[PDB]
Amino acid sequence: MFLYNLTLQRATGISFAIHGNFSGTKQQEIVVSRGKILELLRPDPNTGKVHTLLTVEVFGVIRSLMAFRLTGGTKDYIVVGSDSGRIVILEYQPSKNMFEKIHQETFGKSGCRRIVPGQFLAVDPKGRAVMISAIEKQKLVYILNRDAAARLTISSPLEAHKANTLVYHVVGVDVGFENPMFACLEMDYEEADNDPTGEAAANTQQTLTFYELDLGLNHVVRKYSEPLEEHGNFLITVPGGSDGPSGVLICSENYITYKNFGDQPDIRCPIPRRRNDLDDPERGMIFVCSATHKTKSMFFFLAQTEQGDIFKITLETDEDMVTEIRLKYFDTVPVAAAMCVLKTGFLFVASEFGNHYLYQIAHLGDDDEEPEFSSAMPLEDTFFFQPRPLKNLVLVDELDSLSPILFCQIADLANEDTPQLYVACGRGPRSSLRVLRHGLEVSEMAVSELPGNPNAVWTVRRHIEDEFDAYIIVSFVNATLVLSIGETVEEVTDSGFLGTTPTLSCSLLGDDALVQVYPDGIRHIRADKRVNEWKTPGKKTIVKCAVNQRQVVIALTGGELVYFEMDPSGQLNEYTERKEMSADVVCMSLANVPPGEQRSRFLAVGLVDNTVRIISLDPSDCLQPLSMQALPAQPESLCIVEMFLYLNIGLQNGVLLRTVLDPVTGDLSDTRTGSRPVKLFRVRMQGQEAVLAMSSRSWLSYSYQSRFHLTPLSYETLEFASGFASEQCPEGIVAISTNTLRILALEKLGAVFNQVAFPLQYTPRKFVIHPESNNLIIIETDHNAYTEATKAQRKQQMAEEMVEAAGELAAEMAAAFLNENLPESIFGAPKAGNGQWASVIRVMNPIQGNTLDLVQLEQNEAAFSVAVCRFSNTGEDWYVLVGVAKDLILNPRSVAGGFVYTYKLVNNGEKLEFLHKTPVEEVPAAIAPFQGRVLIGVGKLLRVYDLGKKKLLRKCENKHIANYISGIQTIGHRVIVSDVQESFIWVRYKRNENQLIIFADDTYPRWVTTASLLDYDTVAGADKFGNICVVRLPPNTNDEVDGLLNGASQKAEVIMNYHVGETVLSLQKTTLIPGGSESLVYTTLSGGIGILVPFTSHEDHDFFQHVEMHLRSEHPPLCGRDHLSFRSYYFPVKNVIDGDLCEQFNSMEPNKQKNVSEELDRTPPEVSKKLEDIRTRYAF
Amino acid sequence: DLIFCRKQAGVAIGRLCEKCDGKCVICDSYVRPCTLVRICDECNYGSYQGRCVICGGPGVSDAYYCKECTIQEKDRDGCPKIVNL
Amino acid sequence: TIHSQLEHLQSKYIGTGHADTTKWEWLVNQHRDSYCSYMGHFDLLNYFAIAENESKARVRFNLMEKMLQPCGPPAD
Amino acid sequence: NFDEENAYFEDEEEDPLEAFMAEVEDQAARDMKRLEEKDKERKNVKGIRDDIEEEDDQEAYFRYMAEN
Ligand SMILES: CC[C@H](O)[C@@H](C)[C@H]1O[C@@H]1C[C@@](C)(O)/C=C/C=C(\C)[C@H]1OC(=O)C[C@H](O)CC[C@@](C)(O)[C@@H](OC(=O)N2CCN(C3CCCCCC3)CC2)/C=C/[C@@H]1C
Ligand SMILES: [Zn+2]
Ligand SMILES: [Zn+2]
Ligand SMILES: [Zn+2]
């Protein structure tokens, strides 16, 4: 078994984010880090849209990301520290649209290690030094310089090691062109390892250490070190030099401190709390991120707490000394991992989970009545504020993000033919269930169905500098109707066409000269009311034409090729030659003559002959055959298009061809994507050319900077369409359906999947599908959470206690505190308690989003497993079983017990009714229907359970599973068990002896997250550490059993090992496209979707193996990682080809593409076609 | 007294003499040179500027690690200059 | 003496052992580099922060605080 | 100091400052007198050089060989 890995949807979770002038111009861009992907974004200051410019797979783990600029430069660089032992410096090249590696410096071994630097990265604010640091003793400093050609030079590292030391955070300090300084939060643990009493562990303080780099003497020295009051998280650089003092802000638990070396005293400010908070009073408050905004007049900071409250921090200063810290409540947004404040007044919020946000900073300065807290204010007791809806910010853009994906099911729950992806994702009150579909989403523009026989509609404007169109002309079978956009579009008279017979061509001939072609001839119409008419000689009747604003070719009966032209005079002149051939045309196309040239030469001619003929039409060699190529079937239409020149060949079936424009075909690509004739029509996507192919389903074909995409749309069949433009929407489509006249639009910037979302209450854990009604039964559960009833009674308690505060009892804030509940999706849920849980069972319709039933559980009960099944001793009734833990503590782990609930699932799968509740002595983590009964994993125990009248009846039990059952899967005869730390146990159920016997196990420890059965002998598994494996039983395996490694007697073999780089939580074998092949689809915690597909021949496997081998050397990972070593992170790779490395061939430069291709004995286009073939065989 | 230096390596490139030209510094193999050798600053200074890392004669070409030593990440230790005490 | 230098460099690296290493030192070494590996890998921290319903900054700070004395104070 | 240009150029040969110098001389004399007196010095350590104050890996290896 040999597998090929493909990514269908990249990760969308953000870890780090930096901003700067990375292209060298005055506009600002953001560089975000996914787990293993680097990405450049640019928000538009005119519309507020965030566009993705570049995204690169780095094949490593990005751990720190900084931006810096040399003095006198206008371009920002990118410093990356990763899980390799290298520091890398990158530069964005706007003209090539790629990241160019400038420097690489190796300092240690690879991997996320304790003492090898790469976790912390600081840079001097003037850009002359950079510090890379590990969590332990090792720190390195590089000096950055510049030569006379203005290129960046790097020096050899300087060591600043210090044994038995832990680092919390490092930042560079802003000095005024003095010696560079770095600040560190450090802790010494030497004394704590020598005291058995445990008192040296306590009484141990953090220090704030300052490291000075002396460029004159070329060494790093410890200058200052001071113990702190309590332990603090990250540090903040205060802008110094000539704009501001030069110190640090230490963010801590419940406090924020300013500190500077010299004669400056320490200044502390406590963090304000929300008035009438519902969270556990024992919990403290920390800041989670920060954002600095420097202006040539002043500066301030933006810090956010764990509740999502952003405060605006300013600093009250003297000539050199700081006197006060002032805090003011700014706004409430979701908890972010990073915040970027952009010039032109934009705030970018990258959330830890879920969608990301871009805000417009609407209110500058602060003219408000809300109180401003200060460090000078005396308090014995803490500050209090009231959270409110957004006042300083306005929401401008929202970027979708599937992180974190927790459960997935691929299924056809609607009655389409293509399956949809049902994804339970999100955490807390921002969780949701999302339905993903492959295709584009058609936006509704206009609808007015008119009776008749519509055939075609153009959208031609009166002028060429016009952005407003002139008319739209829909032809009946008996007549036509031509309208204009007066914003109240209806019948129009002064158009000039007024066709009694249908209109088969409407073109903008001149600037305001229009060509009207119809079955009886052509009447050229002026700007003024004048018409010059050429009609048919006798009974020859045109059906097809080929228009262009400089030349018009027509087709009468018999292939009589008649070409016109309109020269700078502005009127008709027909050519002398009329070449006729054997048959009548069925297809032709004239390329849009560019403003650079005078006319179009190529004209593909498809006839009843079933051959494309290419013909010239310039006055030198006009209308004489050049090259002919037969067809596989009856063509309908073709079109020369761009986005470099191609043409497309539409058959009379639901299948397509393509040929690059040249005197000879150079490329070939056919996609089985119908049974209905393909109609090729002109449209404009992204403001440039594209072809809207139409079949039973309508597809859009568009390359995208060498990204070929044939994407369907979310609507049914049409028959004619073209671009549209109006004051209503200047860029759209005019599409025609049966008994319909539609205008449609497509506004999604290159997305493989369209999604709809339905909100939930808590973090979803697992859902099942009812087989009859196709309803979803979901369980949601959260830790540190209140139930609804507990929240209500806690709030009533707080009210009755605040009304008896022993004070005139004359003004009631309690009645105002009880009325309106602030929404938890915006302000967060009150996280209160350490062993407190909250769980819910929900029945949901997947077509709509409505909740059919909702069962709330008691306070400290936590649901972990759910199943829907039928019992043999009962009839055809359905039941729902929910496994629940009781008083679970996670660290140290402790649980009071467990329960199994049983419901009857009545009213056509819409209602749950409680039946009974069976106690168990441990957490039931897995429930699986099995042969008219049910298997339950109760902690370490595997049990069989039958349905009873008052509880569930234990029938069989095995007690030899190692640690903890996390999953159970059954194929008809056997049972597969997943252990939390061991990988897989095979069990057989003896039907007549009533015995569960272990007959096989594995030889590796695996932290299994999920498992999928591939056949009777093979299992696909996933891991907490980001690995996928396939395990198969040897053919020797004996099933009929009644240890050799302290285990089972027979072992299983590992036939596949792959490191993905992200934690997989869903695995499923399925077929994605209609008429395709089966693949293994997986899902990741960062929001990524990927497939593993098998090879069917040795030749494809060998070719792709050689491609991977040659691309491993000549196109190495960007951040210094070894590709083979990265995919062998925990186990060596076995029988997997990385198709994400292989598809990077299409993005190399032509010279290296030729060097790679000439070793495989092939050209780059052939390699590209071979790469596209395997992808389109399985996925989209 | 054949001991490696094992100090933090810098930007200086290691050199080999006419007798050691094809050799790997760590395992003394001659097959598939893969990674350019870096040396520390005290090994590259003054009279020590250009010298064989194996023996110490006048350098003529670049020193390399072999593919076998690169696979095992033996190029990630300190300066590989042979120093005698 | 190259072998002796290797025996001195292996001892230098933090986390290595020898014939007199006790259970406590071994276990605190693996706990400490487990916490560092959790801080490094982006999707393990995601898993923990979803499991215990906390912000990722809070989980990071908790791990750093646990770094000091994992497995309790030593014997005698 | 060598450049055929430097030799060419270096071949053709044939109140406020005073006040600044006086102030500098007074300050220097005071500092020299204070250091000579060594009467009031708290020896406030400016910056500790870790490399200078800590044995190197090679020194540690030599110490280990001497010990055994
Ligand atoms: C155990 C054998 C001994 O150690 C022995 C090599 C050595 O003790 C003797 C002393 C001495 C000086 O006479 C050694 C001679 C040296 C050789 C025979 C090597 O030849 C050279 O140095 C020539 C030159 O340096 C580079 C030639 C080169 C690249 O072919 C080198 O070998 C390689 O790198 N390979 C091995 C791998 N091989 C494959 C073939 C496909 C594409 C190229 C890379 C992979 C290509 C050639 C030399 C081989 C001899 C062992
Ligand atoms: Zn070697
Ligand atoms: Zn030599
Ligand atoms: Zn050295």
Instruction: State the DSSP code for B9.
Output: P
Give strand ranges (E) for A29-84.
29-33, 37-43, 50-57, 62-68, 77-82
* Residue pair A131/A170 in contact by the 8 Å Cβ criterion: yes
* Closest-CA residue to A641 (of A654, A656, A627, A658): A658
Task: Tell whether ligand 1 has an atom less than 6 A from the beta carbon of residue B22.
Answer: yes
Beta bridge mates, A65:
A80
Q: Which ligand 1 atom sits closest to the C-alpha of B32?
A: 34
Q: Which helix (H) or strand (E) holds A358?
A: strand A356-361
- Distance, in Å, from the CA atom of A939 to the CA atom of A960, rounded to the nearest integer, reads 12
Q: What are phi and psi of C3, to 5 degrees?
A: -60, -45
Of B8, B9, B11, the CB nearest to A155: B11
* Residue pair A314/A322 in contact by the 8 Å Cβ criterion: no
Q: Are residues A461 and A385 in the same domain?
A: no
Q: Cα(A119) to centroid of ligand 4, in Å? A: 26
* CA dihedral over A1157, A1160, A1162, A1168, signed as positive or negative: negative
- Distance, in Å, from the CA atom of A665 to the CA atom of A376, rounded to the nearest integer, reads 79
In the three-class reduction of DSSP (H, G, I as helix; E, B as strand; rest coil), residue C34 is classed as helix
Mode of pairing for the β-strands spanning A742-746 and A732-735: antiparallel
Beta bridge mates, A1000:
A986
Structure-token match 């003004």, residue found: A811
In the three-class reduction of DSSP (H, G, I as helix; E, B as strand; rest coil), residue A957 is classed as strand
Structure-token match 């998280």, residue found: A233
Instruction: State the DSSP code for A271.
Output: P
Task: Tell whether ligand 1 has an atom less than 6 A from the beta carbon of residue B32.
Answer: yes
Q: Using CB atoms, list chains with 3+ pairs below 8 Å to chain B.
A: A, C, D
- Name the token pair of A29: 């861009």
- Distance, in Å, from the CA atom of A251 to the CA atom of A801, rounded to the nearest integer, reads 33
A222/D50 Cβ within 8 A? yes
Question: Where would I find the H helices in A781-920?
Answer: 788-803, 814-817, 824-827
Residue nearest to atom 14 of ligand 1 (CA): B30
Helix A1164-1178 × helix A1098-1114 angle, to 10°: 120
Which residue in chain C has the smallest CA separation from B1?
C1
Residues recorded for chain D: 68
Ligand nearest to the CA of B22: 1
Which residue in chain A has the smallest CA separation from C57?
A288
Of A140, A154, A156, the CB nearest to B41: A156
Give strand ranges (E) for A343-431.
346-351, 356-361, 373-374, 384-385, 393-399, 405-411, 420-425
CA distance to A340, A360, A568, A688, per residue, from A46 (Å): 18, 11, 39, 21
**Which chain D residues are within 8 Å of A219, Cβ to Cβ?**
49, 51
Q: Which ligand 1 atom sits closest to the C-alpha of B33?
A: 34
- Name the token pair of A1167: 């390699």
**Which chain B residues are within 8 Å of D62, Cβ to Cβ?**
85
CA distance to A27, A92, A112, per residue, from A100 (Å): 20, 6, 25
Residue nearest to atom 21 of ligand 1 (CA): B30
Mutate to test the interface with A, among D44, D46, D50, D53 (most CBs of A within 10 A): D50
**What residues contact residue A749 under an 8 Å CB cut-off, 6+ apart?**
A51, A686
CA distance to A131, A231, A581, C33, per residue, from A170 (Å): 9, 15, 80, 20
* Residue pair A1146/A1168 in contact by the 8 Å Cβ criterion: yes
* Residue pair A174/A241 in contact by the 8 Å Cβ criterion: yes
**What residues contact residue A791 under an 8 Å CB cut-off, 6+ apart?**
A278, A830
Residue D57 touches chain B, beta carbons under 8 Å? yes
- What total number of domains does chain B contain? 1
Exposed e or buried b for every residue in A272-308, given b needs 16+ CB within 10 A?
Answer: bbbeebbbeeeeebbbbbbbbbeeeeebbbbbbbbbb
How many other C-beta atoms lie within 10 A of the C-beta of residue A394?
A: 12
- Distance, in Å, from the CA atom of A1121 to the CA atom of A1008, rounded to the nearest integer, reads 27
- Name the token pair of A535: 């009609």
Mutate to test the interface with B, among D50, D56, D57 (most CBs of B within 10 A): D57
- Name the token pair of A466: 């016009």
Mode of pairing for the β-strands spanning A851-856 and A837-844: antiparallel
* Closest-CA residue to A1180 (of A1061, A1060, A1091, A1050): A1091
Residue D66 touches chain C, beta carbons under 8 Å? no
In the three-class reduction of DSSP (H, G, I as helix; E, B as strand; rest coil), residue A1071 is classed as strand
Please report the resolution in angstroms.
2.7
- Distance, in Å, from the CA atom of A376 to the CA atom of A36, rounded to the nearest integer, reads 46
Residues recorded for chain B: 85
CATH of the domain at A646: 2.130.10.10
- Distance, in Å, from the CA atom of A274 to the CA atom of A932, rounded to the nearest integer, reads 54
CA atoms within 13 A on the CB side of C70: 19
For chain C, how far is it from start to end, CA to CA, in angstroms? 38
Question: Where would I find the H helices in A804-930?
Answer: 814-817, 824-827
Beta bridge mates, A239:
none
Q: Are residues A129 and A38 in the same domain?
A: yes
Give strand ranges (E) for A514-610.
514-518, 521-525, 531-535, 544-546, 553-555, 561-566, 572-574, 585-590, 603-607
* Residue pair B4/B84 in contact by the 8 Å Cβ criterion: no
- Distance, in Å, from the CA atom of C53 to the CA atom of A406, rounded to the nearest integer, reads 14
Residue D11 touches chain B, beta carbons under 8 Å? no
* Residue pair A132/A117 in contact by the 8 Å Cβ criterion: yes
In the three-class reduction of DSSP (H, G, I as helix; E, B as strand; rest coil), residue A248 is classed as strand
In the three-class reduction of DSSP (H, G, I as helix; E, B as strand; rest coil), residue A247 is classed as coil
- Complete DSSP assignment for A434-491: EEEEESBPEEEEEE---SS------EE-SSSS-SS--EEEEE-SS-EEEE--SSS--B
Instruction: State the DSSP code for C33.
Output: H
CA distance to A108, A813, A845, A1115, D53, per residue, from A153 (Å): 21, 65, 62, 24, 31
* Residue pair A7/A343 in contact by the 8 Å Cβ criterion: no
- Distance, in Å, from the CA atom of A708 to the CA atom of A704, rounded to the nearest integer, reads 6
* Residue pair A646/A660 in contact by the 8 Å Cβ criterion: yes
Q: Are residues A529 and A583 in the same domain?
A: yes
Fill in the amino acid letter for A85.
G
**Which chain A residues are within 8 Å of D47, Cβ to Cβ?**
212, 221-223
Which region holds residue A1026: left if phi is over 0, alpha if psi is between -120 and 50, else beta? left
How far off is chain C from B31, nearest CA to CA, in Å?
23
- Name the token pair of A465: 């500098």
Q: Using CB atoms, list chains with 3+ pairs below 8 Å to chain D.
A: A, B, C
C1/B2 Cβ within 8 A? yes
Give strand ranges (E) for A306-355.
309-317, 322-332, 336-342, 346-351
Mode of pairing for the β-strands spanning A152-154 and A139-146: antiparallel
- Distance, in Å, from the CA atom of A1080 to the CA atom of A1059, rounded to the nearest integer, reads 15
- Distance, in Å, from the CA atom of A571 to the CA atom of A548, rounded to the nearest integer, reads 14
- Distance, in Å, from the CA atom of A975 to the CA atom of A978, rounded to the nearest integer, reads 10
Residue A109 touches chain B, beta carbons under 8 Å? yes
* Residue pair A1029/A1020 in contact by the 8 Å Cβ criterion: yes
Structure-token match 């850009």, residue found: A127
Exposed e or buried b for every residue in A955-969, given b needs 16+ CB within 10 A?
Answer: ebebeebeebbbbbb
Mode of pairing for the β-strands spanning A603-607 and A139-146: unpaired
Give strand ranges (E) for A526-678.
531-535, 544-546, 553-555, 561-566, 572-574, 585-590, 603-607, 611-615, 625-630, 635-641, 646-651, 655-660, 671-672
* Closest-CA residue to A923 (of A939, A935, A906): A939
**Which chain C residues are within 8 Å of A113, Cβ to Cβ?**
33, 36
Fill in the amino acid letter for A643.
M
- Name the token pair of A141: 């400093």
**What residues contact residue A324 under an 8 Å CB cut-off, 6+ apart?**
A267, A315, A316, A374, A375, A376
Task: Tell whether ligand 1 has an atom less than 6 A from the beta carbon of residue B30.
Answer: yes
Q: What is the 3-state composition of chain D as percent helix, strand, coil, each rounded to the nearest 5?
A: 65, 0, 35
Reading across the β-sheet that carries A471-475, which strands appear in turn? A459-460, A471-475, A480-483
- Name the token pair of A1143: 């598809």
Which of B16, B26, B30 should be mutated for ligand 1, with most atoms under 8 A from CB?
B30
CA distance to A551, A605, A840, per residue, from A545 (Å): 11, 11, 65
* Residue pair A31/A39 in contact by the 8 Å Cβ criterion: yes
State the Cα angle at A977 between A974 and A983, rounded to 5°. 125
How far off is chain C from D51, nearest CA to CA, in Å?
17
How far off is chain A from C68, nearest CA to CA, in Å?
6
Task: Tell whether ligand 1 has an atom less than 6 A from the beta carbon of residue B36.
Answer: no
Beta bridge mates, A967:
A978
* Closest-CA residue to B63 (of A1058, B28, A1052, B77): B28
* Residue pair A245/A267 in contact by the 8 Å Cβ criterion: no
- Name the token pair of A377: 């204010």
Residue A159 burial by Cβ neighbours in a 10 Å radius (0-12, 13-18, 19+): middle
- Complete DSSP assignment for A5-32: EEEEE-----SEEEEE--SSSSS-EEEE
Domain span holding position B47: 1-85
Domain span holding position A221: 3-399
Q: Cα(B25) to centroid of ligand 4, in Å? A: 13
Which residue in chain D has the smallest CA separation from B7?
D57
C2/B2 Cβ within 8 A? yes
Q: Are residues A388 and A453 in the same domain?
A: no
Task: Tell whether ligand 1 has an atom less than 6 A from the beta carbon of residue B27.
Answer: no
Residue D60 touches chain C, beta carbons under 8 Å? yes
Beta bridge mates, A779:
A766, A841
- Name the token pair of A698: 């309508």
* Residue pair A6/A1091 in contact by the 8 Å Cβ criterion: yes
Ligand nearest to the CA of B83: 4
**What residues contact residue A236 under an 8 Å CB cut-off, 6+ apart?**
A171, A248, A249, A250, A251, A290, A292, A301, A303
Ligand nearest to the CA of B64: 2
CA atoms within 13 A on the CB side of A954: 12
**Which chain B residues are within 8 Å of C5, Cβ to Cβ?**
3-4, 6
* Residue pair A546/A553 in contact by the 8 Å Cβ criterion: yes
- Distance, in Å, from the CA atom of A285 to the CA atom of A314, rounded to the nearest integer, reads 20
Residue A672 burial by Cβ neighbours in a 10 Å radius (0-12, 13-18, 19+): middle
Q: Are residues A373 and A450 in the same domain?
A: no
- Distance, in Å, from the CA atom of A909 to the CA atom of A281, rounded to the nearest integer, reads 43
Instruction: State the DSSP code for A818.
Output: T
- Complete DSSP assignment for D5-34: HHHHHTT----HHHHHHHHHHHHHHHHHHH
Q: Cα–chain-centroid distance for residue B49?
A: 13
* CA dihedral over B80, C1, C7, C12, signed as positive or negative: negative
Fill in the amino acid letter for A488.
T
Beta bridge mates, A532:
A524
In the three-class reduction of DSSP (H, G, I as helix; E, B as strand; rest coil), residue D37 is classed as helix
- Name the token pair of D47: 């910056």
- Name the token pair of A134: 């590990």
- Distance, in Å, from the CA atom of A1011 to the CA atom of A1000, rounded to the nearest integer, reads 16
How far off is chain A from D45, nearest CA to CA, in Å?
9
Q: What are phi and psi of A101, to 5 degrees?
A: -70, 120
Question: A1109-1115 contacts: CB < 8 A, separation 24 or more?
Answer: A1110/A1156, A1110/A1159, A1110/A1160, A1111/A1141, A1111/A1142, A1111/A1144, A1111/A1145, A1111/A1156, A1112/A1141, A1114/A1152, A1114/A1155, A1114/A1156, A1115/A1141, A1115/A1144, A1115/A1145, A1115/A1148, A1115/A1152
**Which chain D residues are within 8 Å of A221, Cβ to Cβ?**
47-50
B8/A107 Cβ within 8 A? yes
Looking at chain A, after which residues does the C atom sit over 2.5 Å from the next written N, breaking the chain?
Answer: 380, 643, 673, 808, 1042
- Name the token pair of D12: 């053709």
B34 annotated to a ligand binding site: no
Mutate to test the interface with A, among D44, D45, D49, D57 (most CBs of A within 10 A): D49
- Distance, in Å, from the CA atom of A235 to the CA atom of A300, rounded to the nearest integer, reads 15
Give strand ranges (E) for A939-993.
941-947, 952-958, 965-971, 974-979, 984-990
- Name the token pair of A876: 């055809």
Instruction: State the DSSP code for A848.
Output: S
Exposed e or buried b for every residue in A619-645, given b needs 16+ CB within 10 A?
Answer: eeebbeeeeeeebeeebbbbbbbebee
Which residue in chain D has the smallest CA separation from A223?
D47
Structure-token match 């031509």, residue found: A482
Exposed e or buried b for every residue in C7-46, given b needs 16+ CB within 10 A?
Answer: ebbeeeebeeeeeeeeeebeebbeebbebbebbbbbbbbb
Ligand nearest to the CA of B73: 2
* Closest-CA residue to A1140 (of A1162, A1112, A1119): A1112
How far off is chain D from C42, nearest CA to CA, in Å?
34
Residue A157 touches chain B, beta carbons under 8 Å? yes
- Distance, in Å, from the CA atom of A224 to the CA atom of A210, rounded to the nearest integer, reads 5
How many other C-beta atoms lie within 10 A of the C-beta of residue B27?
A: 12
- Name the token pair of A1112: 């491993």
Q: Count interface pairs A-B at CB distance under 8 A.
A: 25
- Name the token pair of B31: 């097959």
Task: Tell whether ligand 1 has an atom less than 6 A from the beta carbon of residue B31.
Answer: yes
- Distance, in Å, from the CA atom of A799 to the CA atom of A270, rounded to the nearest integer, reads 26
How far off is chain D from A103, nearest CA to CA, in Å?
27
Mode of pairing for the β-strands spanning A1136-1138 and A3-9: parallel
